Amino acid sequence: MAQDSVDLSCDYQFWMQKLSVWDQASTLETQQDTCLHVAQFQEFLRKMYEALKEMDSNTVIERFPTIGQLLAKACWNPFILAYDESQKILIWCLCCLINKEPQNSGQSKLNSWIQGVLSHILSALRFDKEVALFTQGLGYAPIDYYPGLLKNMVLSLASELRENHLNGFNTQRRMAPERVASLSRVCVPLITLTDVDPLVEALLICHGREPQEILQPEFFEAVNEAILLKKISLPMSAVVCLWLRHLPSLEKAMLHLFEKLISSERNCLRRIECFIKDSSLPQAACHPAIFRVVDEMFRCALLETDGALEIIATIQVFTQCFVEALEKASKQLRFALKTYFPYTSPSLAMVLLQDPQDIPRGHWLQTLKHISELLREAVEDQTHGSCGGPFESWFLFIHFGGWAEMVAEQLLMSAAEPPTALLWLLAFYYGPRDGRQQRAQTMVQVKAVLGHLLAMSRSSSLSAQDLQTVAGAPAQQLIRHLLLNFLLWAPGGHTIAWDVITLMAHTAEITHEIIGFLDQTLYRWNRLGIESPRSEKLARELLKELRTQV
Amino acid sequence: MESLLQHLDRFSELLAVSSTTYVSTWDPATVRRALQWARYLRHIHRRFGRHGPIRTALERRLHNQWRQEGGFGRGPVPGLANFQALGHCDVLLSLRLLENRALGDAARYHLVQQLFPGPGVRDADEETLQESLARLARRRSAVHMLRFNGYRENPNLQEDSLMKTQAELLLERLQEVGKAEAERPARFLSSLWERLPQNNFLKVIAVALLQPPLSGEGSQVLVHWLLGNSEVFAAFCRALPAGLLTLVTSRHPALSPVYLGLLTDWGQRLHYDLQKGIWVGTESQDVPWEELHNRFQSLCQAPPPLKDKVLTALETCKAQDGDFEVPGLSIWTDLLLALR
Amino acid sequence: PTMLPECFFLGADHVVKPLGIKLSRNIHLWDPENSVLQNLKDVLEIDFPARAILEKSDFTMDCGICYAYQLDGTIPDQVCDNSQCGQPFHQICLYEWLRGLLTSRQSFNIIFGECPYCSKPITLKM
Amino acid sequence: EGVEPAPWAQLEAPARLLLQALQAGPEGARRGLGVLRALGSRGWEPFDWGRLLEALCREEPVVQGPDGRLELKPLLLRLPRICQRNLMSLLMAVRPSLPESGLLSVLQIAQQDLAPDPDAWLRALGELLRRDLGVGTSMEGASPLSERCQRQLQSLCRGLGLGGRRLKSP
């Protein structure tokens, strides 16, 4: 109960003076301008609809001054009347202004004018003359040929574009580049019209030989947006070529993935996996150009946070999807891995690509122990002919889930006399760029902590305070996560998990982090097919209750 | 089956009078009854509209309706044109009522309220009437925009996009009359030829003669109609461009010999004047040298089944008029020379 | 060089899989003090042929435009009329290529043009 | 009037074939590798990159902007826009076996300093190629991305709990 007129009475004058500037978009500049502003116009009309619906016609005169001129100007512009719902709302506004029982001649004139403009929308013969004449003879109404004609109109145009593509450097008939840009502007307001989809796919695949961009960026954005909300459903080759010709559209698409992992679906990796596979990014990222730019936006996010676990998991999912699509669809002549991951020793990647589904559960220790050795070489023995640094070898290692998370659980499986190389790998995970004094201090703390935990596990089901003693910093998240892995692993868990979780969940950030952790872990288990049903049911119940605290 | 006859004919009568300017007595009661009937028909088309005696029975009823009316004199009312239009009969009626100025105010209001309740019923199982009319406005605007921003009149008419839709309409109208078998296609074509603009019709015919079948009974009927009626074929081969008629003739060998007779006759009614080095006709409507050269050049630049035929038809007309070997004496010599 | 190489497998999906598995199991056994061959042989746990066929190597029988066998049912059928090329093609790839070049001219169902690899007269009948 | 010859017309045939191959859309890049192996196969087993990387910088004239304005464009900006982005992709793929002096002249073109209406993909592949030499650290805010996306991505990462890891170094 605050404004009710003011913002709207301003927007009214803005839009009315703009419609007056526009009307019918018979030029270039009116067209580009309409296609831009149209989306807001739609919202303006929804608000206007709400306003006129709640009240009634012919009695009140609030904005009845120029509502007529506004709706007319709107209707004769066809880039407005072809956008998503504009027409349906414009009908509604005129249905409200009608009157059942006119008294003064103004109400009758209004109703007549309304019938006139509605008829112009629905049923006016502004089309070619001879084609109109031909049909009446055969006894056809507009409706029962409009569809085929459109269909047959579209296919024509698509062929011409198809032919212009093959005539690259040929003495004939060059499709005038003005018309290609024109079509690109005309497809934009009506992308959610199913009858035109054939035209889009042809425009995107038929790039042409012209070195300048012949399509205008209002077109790329509309297609891109519409692929991501699933309102157009193109085929994959079209979206890959859109990504490859308009890099700011690939940024706006990969940001729309980061909103998916930050806002809507935090730490539900099944909905992220579903989204990524359904989106085409994995299929598109088989192209080295797109994987270097998609990977660069992940790095920017990896640095802005100082190693957020939520980003890491998304990267792991993405990389797992990407792998079985690089594999799936490049039999002979595929790109060499130093071309996607160009900084590290290729050796290392070649190791980390090997899926742990393929390996027996018992031989994971050997493989990790080897990887650790080669990673230690690549970071600490930083000589020429190697990585750029520790961060880069880290950023690689992060891409491959499976390996990075099984580490603690293998230390617990070999908790008696932990191997120092695994301790090294784990300490390296939670912090690189530390220096040996830090890494050593962390490792010896961790070894002492593991000494405490093996003793506590082989003991009975004990309290949570005994755990806060050893927990009691820069090395907290490592110990926290190791202790959570201990809870899920040890059969002493499922009794005292809550006692530790409540105390550990100081803030909301640690809670969210632990939720993420547990989701990642169950995703990882269900993927690798490694499971103890105690931990599965335990983690599911804990996750259920922690999703309530938020 | 019999239950549907009195329904469908009644609906067709109500629809036909809908467009007519007698609308005074109409009310929300009439319109509601109309739209509920239309709902029933739209449901029928959906339920058991394919592959049965019911579909064909209804087609029989419809086409008999459209031929007892015919479309001459008392009213050229469309009516619902064909079985597919049952699936959108309700839209047609509504559009007609919006066009009838004589509609009363309370009727119009109830109507528009039943088409456009608002987004109160955004969730609906059956694609309702409001969505249908919005989707119609969308298509209409899309068609206008393509025409005025992308579309170009292709020269090879067969591949153009307006003509190719007209063609397929005509072809559907021949197939329906063939299956009906009530009156012969020749009658339909003759009636068409008088009513509507002829040059347009002819362009259309050319392209309809080339569309592949969609079941070649369509083309097979038109060749017979044309060979029956010479005057049109006189204006046919006179109006179209060259390459089109070349593709026509290679497609239909039945059209080759007569067309050559037509050309041969236009040659024989030219005379050469020595002062300007050009064959000319006496009368103005006799095809000039250039057009006749064009057509023969198109005919000769064709598949070999026609090349030998036209070439032999020309040589026999040369030798017929004295076997001269020098220009100024025989149009047929000047053609055979202007080919090498 | 002596360090582990990038290696992967082309061929029959049923033959390669056990090889990938065996590789996965033995990759820890790689050692950059021996030779590449002397490491690979005990890693993949198999021996090599020393030139099993020297004459009839896999003469690449792929499109030489799209580099695939089996493009949409079609086979590499259209070939080069040349002893030094002999390169097969597909109808579709080789049609879209020849319709591009400036030199090419089209009769009724025929296009004459230059073979992409050797630039000799090649004919394509649709 | 409107016949244009292909701008790679005058080059040694092998380069002509490579550039012809890359033209063919996004699967354009892959094809390039098949082309290079299919010329390792033929009589000239080595492929003389140094000449293609010279020829890619050579300039010719064009008339763009208003109607009349003479400008000199090197080859790399004059050949079709999907060939550009799949060339630079295939150089990213085979960087190690290229002479650096030529490569640098190309990147020098790619950077497109003070051009208005640049080709964002050419610039970003410039920068990612520089980064792969390492001689193009550049001491800049020279990132592959736009400033606009990086700002909205900072804007987004802020709504997430920063981690106990230490990756950025003083």
Ligand SMILES: [Zn+2]
């Ligand atoms: Zn092929």
Ligand SMILES: [Zn+2]
């Ligand atoms: Zn060859």
